Design a protein around this ligand. Sequence first.
Ligand code: HEM
Ligand SMILES: [C-]#N
Length: 117
Amino acid sequence: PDAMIVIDGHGIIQLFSTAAERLFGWSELEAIGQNVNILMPEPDRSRHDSYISRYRTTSDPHIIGIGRIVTGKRRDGTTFPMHLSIGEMQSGGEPYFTGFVRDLTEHQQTQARLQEL
Ligand code: HEM
Ligand SMILES: [C-]#N
């Protein structure tokens, strides 16, 4: 039951788990109705809707069901690495996407500390 975010086909946050609140700093009510791009930094932020549009038309997976590390952005403006897995679903005839997130800040810190010593 980690950080899970569900968005519609236009990238608007539909569900936002409790763990996602603790990780991103946004309450579920504040997040719901916002675009998922509020969780990442630029350039990705301004680019995110184009990535979603691209996929929706080419039916071309780039990261759907792949799993990878990106940098996300918390409410206070701080950035952090996180592993992200996007899953695709359908409901009411329209696409929905789910993102499972695993915070990796601690890992990056440990790795960094071990490097500097
Ligand atoms: C918060 C950190 C995130 C960042 C930095 C990020 C970044 C990106 C990038 C760079 C792409 C396109 C990659 C490519 O075309 O190779 C992309 C695509 C997309 N993202 Fe995100 N994303 C984030 C979170 C999310 C979340 C949480 C969702 C769903 C809950 C989501 C849904 C999508 C979808 C549906 C696409 C298009 C899928 C595809 O191109 O196959 N993203 N994202
Ligand atoms: C986006 N992944």
